[model samples]
Target: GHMLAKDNEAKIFTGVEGEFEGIIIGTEDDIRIYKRDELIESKYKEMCIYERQRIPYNSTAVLLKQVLVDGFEELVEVESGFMVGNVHIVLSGQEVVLEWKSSYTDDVLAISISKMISD
Candidate 1:
C-alpha cells in the first residue's frame, strides 16, 4: 500500500495491491524507517570522523537474534538507503513491502523473505 520514490515524486509505484494504510517517509540523504510510530530500522551512514568520508563495505547485516531479544517483531522489508537494526524490527501481524528506487542501478535490491521464529 506504500510507494517508492519515482520520477518527480508523482510516478512512484506501490508494490502491493489493496488499500493500504501506512506512513511513507522519503529522504534525499538517507534516513531510518519506523513502523507504527516505533523505531524499527535505520541505515548506517559510513563516515570517517576524521575525514568525514563514506566508508567502503562498512555496512552491517540485520541481526535477527538481537531484534528478537530486544522485544521487537517481524521485519518485512528494508530499502536501499536504510538498514535494519535491532530496534527497527516489524512484529508479527504487520506487513511490509519492499520497493526499489529507480535511481539505483548497481544491485538487484529486493525484500523477499519473511521473519519467523522456530520452535
Candidate 2:
C-alpha cells in the first residue's frame, strides 16, 4: 500500500531503487518511526564479503575430516550430539559449511564462531 500526498511531491524511484527517511542518530546505526500500521516488503542489494585460503595442494576431504576429528575433543554429550572418530556419532548434530573463499579474518571469526556454536 502506498500514500499519495494530494501529491505533496512526486518521488520517482527509477530502475530498481527506493527512498526511505530515518534519522541522524549516531555514527553507527539509525532508527525510524512509522505512524500507520502497514504491510511492507523491502529488498536490498549489497556487495558481500569474500576471502580465500590455500590448503596445501594435496588436501583431500578425508584429510579435512580427519583434521576436524582430531582437532576437537573425543566426546561432549549434553543432549543429542556427541563425539566421533571412535565411531561415536550423535542423533542431533550440527555442521558448518564454509565456502566462497570465506576467510573470516580474526575478529569476525571469533564472534561468528561463538554464535555458530550456540545455534
Candidate 3:
C-alpha cells in the first residue's frame, strides 16, 4: 500500500525512450516525483534538479504490477500481480515500466526504502 525511495540515493530509469532519464527523488502523498537528467558524453550530467513533475492522473492507465528488484536478491514480484522481466508501475495517470536486470551481483547493492520518503 506504500513505498518510498532511498535517502540521498538517486535511481535512474532507462526504459522510457528519451534524451533524459528519470531519476526518482522521492514521493509525496503517494505520488512519485522524479528529476530529469540529460545524458552527456556517456555520463549522467546534472541538469535542473529543482523542477519536479507528476503526470496528470489518467484512469486509462491501469496498475499492472509492482516489483522490487533488490541487489543480489531474487526478483521480488508484486503481490497479487505477476511480473516476468519488467515491472510496470502506474503512477496515477502515468505508467512507468521498468526493465529489471539480473546482473546485479558482486559489488552491487540494493536500494532500500528511505525513512522520510516511505511514510
Candidate 4:
C-alpha cells in the first residue's frame, strides 16, 4: 500500500491502499471513505481543499488540517470482516497524526512519513 497525505473537503486523491477498492467519500482533506465492496453512487458531504507542504522534516511533522475533530477513523475490510491495523489514529482538527503504537502493548515498527518516502 502507498501512504497518501489527504482529506478535508476538496475531493483530493493522494492515496492508494494496497488492494482495497471502494467508493470513498469525504471532504477536501480527509479520506472520508467507505469500502466499495458493495455500494452505490454518491457525493461527499462537505467542500474543502486538501493541500500539502513539505517543510524540513521533524520527529513529528505537524500537518495542517483545521476541520478534523475526531480520533481514529480506520479503514475496514468488508469480506474478511476486519479492520486494517494502525488503529487509534487521530484525525482531529488541523492534522492527521502518525504515531508509534509502542511495544508495551505490542511490538511495533514505525517511521515518520518523510522517512517513509523518497520524493
Lowest-sum lDDT 10-residue window in model 2: 33-42
Candidate 3 has which clashing residue pairs, if any?
Answer: 58-93
Best by TM-score: 2
Clashes of each: 6, 1, 1, 21
75 Cα displacement, candidate 2 (Å): 14
Q: Sort all candidates by TM-score, best to worst.
A: 2, 4, 3, 1
Candidate 2: tens digits of C-alpha lDDT, residues 15-90: 2224443212111232223211121222322234533222222334343344444444442332432333222222
Q: In terms of lDDT, which candidate is strongest?
A: 3
TM per model? 0.17, 0.25, 0.17, 0.19
Off by over 4 Å in 3: 1-77, 80-82, 86-92, 102-119
lDDT of 4 by residue, 1-119 (tens): 22335323334243346665656554333455454542333343233332232324222212211111111233333332222243223332333334434333211212222233211
Q: Better model by TM-score, 1 or 4?
A: 4
Candidate 2 vs. true structure, TM-score: 0.25
- Model 3 scores a C-alpha lDDT of 0.33
Taking every candidate in turn, the Cα RMSD to the unseen true structure, in Å, is 19.3, 13.7, 21.0, 19.5
For residues 24-92, write the lDDT of model 3, one tens digit per residue: 434442333243533333354554322112233323322222123322144434554333333222233
**Residue 86 in candidate 1, Cα distance off native in Å:** 19
lDDT of 2 at 100: 34
